[PDB]
């Protein structure tokens, strides 16, 4: 059995069970995380790509902590680049948990794993077998498998070329679902995670997952230097898994929904795969084939199957006090999504919409979290009603209408759509880029203590 | 027992389990496949093609992966023409499972197909016993029995010749139902096997299956170079089961629609029968027997029986944010077609049979999936009532009412079909062609790593 | 006990217990066969006529597959024509199953027969005591029972005069009930058989058993190169049994439904009856007895007796676009059509009548398929309607009221008839035709196939 830090009668454990068939789940709640959820997942991820690969393969960590490789049978090498405030906290988590096992494992190549600290304390920039503090792009080892366990911080095709010319043959990407991020969407949630992201610019509006306001009589309106009058989302988002928050930039996000078939065509060339093969209601897990020489064609489509609805809303809320209209994303449960169809055959009003979604959320026992059941009753009440002007509005089979520009072009009015409903085993297709061409760090006085640890 | 992977309480199983009735199918779920109905239904169907043809014979793979085909009593002989990305990892994962065979079996001729690997790596135009890198039109292995799963992008009566001219007098073709594609349709699905299927102009429509669109006012109208002014349903259309996309072609789609008879006359003459031998709910398996020399004639027609019933209708949506019209095609439950026939007896509105089938549905144990109901809510809506308009205009039993086009022709009014609803126990009869006559690939860094792992 | 494959809880299976009563009828499904019940049927109807006919009698096969007719005690003689694409395969089949016999049997005459078909192949031209490749009206074996398995595209005169000069006294026919061709429908369905049948000019009907039509906005009505003004009921029709598709003249499917009593009167004169001994929801089994020498007279009229309702309607469908009208036919349950008596006794309209057609079936255990209800339902309807047509109009007992031409001829109008409804244990009688007195397809590719299989 695998023991996951959840509460015993969460109702999250049955969707990690139906998510990992393989394993038995069983909960053993030794910790108050209020993103216990989201670590649930990533530990059971690990145990199958563990039994996915070769135990004969060499396996690279990017960008993850050393301490939690060790203990596993597997041959690890963590590669840690120190790029943030964590990874020197990680390397000392990492010689601590190494001396209370000096002898009490004599199993997991603890007596290798304390040399190949001190080794490369002694020279960094050295290639050791299980650790390196190189960036995935630096580091010189050889292996066939890697991890990218939570890293969404790396460009894709790139960093996948550097593990692919080293010999990885199998790349695996833990994650949330990037699919919200190629709809291109302002602010969204990942409600069974406890998850909120915003666009920085909306940090400051009123009612959505991750914001924070102030009160206000509204009565200044003077203060704008210059004009924005455009309001789409820029690069910079903010993650807030539970209440740890982490930065990240809109291309790096984009840049792992890879198409199903992609080309590295480098100084050396590969054709590569992307298959998801786990997914729990936002947060995935993909697989990633790369193999050497160019082979088929690509048609650079990127797909994701929906087992529970998708939704995306134009919101208005009041960022910073000012009345703006933004789009916000974020997933439903399949059985409320199921039980909204018969509703959703007419135009129902966002208040008829909430209340019919409270008696199924409460039908104490919530399937979906209530903060998101508002603007997904918008989101339906919007739907439900392009969905009747496509029907009074019907066209003839096979046809266009468009109107000259009186010049030399045609012209064809835009419809409003406010809603992206994708329901329950819907896919999403998206056109991505294939075909990619274009391809220290430690102090003294950390590095004298990582050492003196053991 | 045959051993299906998917999970227990799968209403599936039952289905799976009239259509295979000579094996006993027990659940075995291993794995949170997004499409895992299409893979049971596939094992399935090489468990029988394996008893239906004799143990002493040859059988050919046409496009099919050489790694799952051993452990199997039967002399099988992939050919493997390496046309996509797949291949590459299919021939990499086969050479990997041979090595962990190698003495722990010595029952399926593990000793004999790593020798076959290697002759091949030696020699690559080679034609080896159990394995060859050539095309279906390229290989020169003679035998007795072709099968072809999940081999769309093939020419049929192309591949079927040139099987046959090297013996082959039975082929098996494993496939999705290639009738949606007779009807010609834009768009459609298969919901019980979660795949979605769409025509490359409407990737853009708002709710489809297969589709993902963006959020607007539609207040831009003016980027339109030149004017379609016509969406007939080209030839590039992509599939999605579950998340794996695959592209086809129509033309390679409808050349497996075959009739009963058929000749292949070229160089030699054969006369062809296709028999579709199993069809579960948009999954079928055809039998094409093929002959030598030309008997009887051939009347040119195709037929497909509907066990449940099939529609194909037109909607209004909004590609790239223009409203359009298009036909999409959907298989709905013969239990929900049976509990609508009493209320199609008049003209019912898409809202009242919208809620009609949300009841037959729930009546959380859905029959059929809900991103469908609306759309075969508005289907039954329209047949419903242009029944009605054939009741009201009664012509004279056995005469026609063609008007003269004022010089020598006539001219009779047609009327609007907008649904073609083809019951369960009805049939379908398409006019097809008959009477046929007109009939590298691996690099040096991958067949230096093949004979590697082993 | 006889085992048919059809499924345990069918409810086809006390229909068939009814239609052979010295069974004991076991349901052994094997197979998802879409035509279950059709063989299930005639797989009883062969048990029935070995039992009825003498063991020590030869039989003539005509047109049938050598390889079901082994394994019986009987003196089998099949004569195959090969004029169709199947009796290669047939052939195929039987030297193949021939071949999983020699040893394993030794009380079928299976090493008689292997010579049989070695002795064929060597000379094709010859007459052997169990198979010969000719014709029905060339074969030159003398027996005295002849049975017509699924025989419909034979003329039956010629083919019995030239069976009963060669010593045939007996003939069994097993086929479908030609009465739906006796009174000359357009299309029709036998639905206890999932079969349908269509004339090839409404091929593109839009709603009955066997079309397949498309969709259109009925805006271009201009391509009539001539009229037609004129949709009769030509010789060309295709029947479809599940999904087998076969084509047959309507001249050769009247030609079997054969009066009580006829004369074969040629070089030599016999006298004939026709007895219908086996009928199950349009599936009969017919026997022909054939004496020489002309005996009694011939009153040229030929019985059928309705079991289960049998409706002819004239329904109105749009074909290929245009709206017509055609008679359509098909076969009711008697207990539906005993349960519709009281309904019929006023004008009920199509709605009404269909909706109460729908509580009696549903009263999921259907008792008729529901593809018919709504014709059926029509079919009521005008019936009912007609029915009080003649009571409001009565006329006078035993005149009649002809109107002079104004010449030297008399008038009568003509009333019109849309629907004939035979009810259950009524009679058709037809006028037929008696007195009748009008009475190398194998390559060297197959024929060193067939005897290599053995
Ligand atoms: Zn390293
Ligand atoms: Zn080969
Ligand atoms: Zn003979």
Redesign the interface.
Known sequence: PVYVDIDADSAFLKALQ?????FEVEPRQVTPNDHANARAFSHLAIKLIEQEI?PDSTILDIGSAPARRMMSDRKYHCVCPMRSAEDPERLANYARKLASAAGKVLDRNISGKIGDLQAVMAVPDTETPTFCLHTDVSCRQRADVAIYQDVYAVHAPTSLYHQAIKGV?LAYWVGFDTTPF???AMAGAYPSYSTNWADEQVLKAKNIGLCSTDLTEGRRGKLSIMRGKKLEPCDRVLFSVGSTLYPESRKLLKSWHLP??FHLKGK?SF???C??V??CEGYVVKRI?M???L?????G?????H?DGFL???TTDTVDGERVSF?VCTYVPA?I???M??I???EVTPEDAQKLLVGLNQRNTNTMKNYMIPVVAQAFSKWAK??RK??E??????????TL?CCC???????????????????????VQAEFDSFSGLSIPLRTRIKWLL
Chains 1, 2, 3 share one sequence.
């Open positions: 139906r998510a990992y068939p393989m070769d043959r190629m709809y291109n199903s078939v050396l054709t590569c795969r298959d998801t786990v997914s084939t193999s050497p020489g082979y088929g064609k690509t048609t489509y990127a797909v994701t199957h087992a995306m809303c134009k789009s059985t999504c199921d039980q169809t018969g959703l055959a007419t392009e969905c496509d029907m509005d019907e066209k003839l089979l096979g046809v266009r209408e468009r520009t072009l045609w012209a064809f009015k835009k419809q409003k759509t406010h809603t992206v409903y994708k329901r329950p085993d819907t896919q999403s297709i998206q056109k």
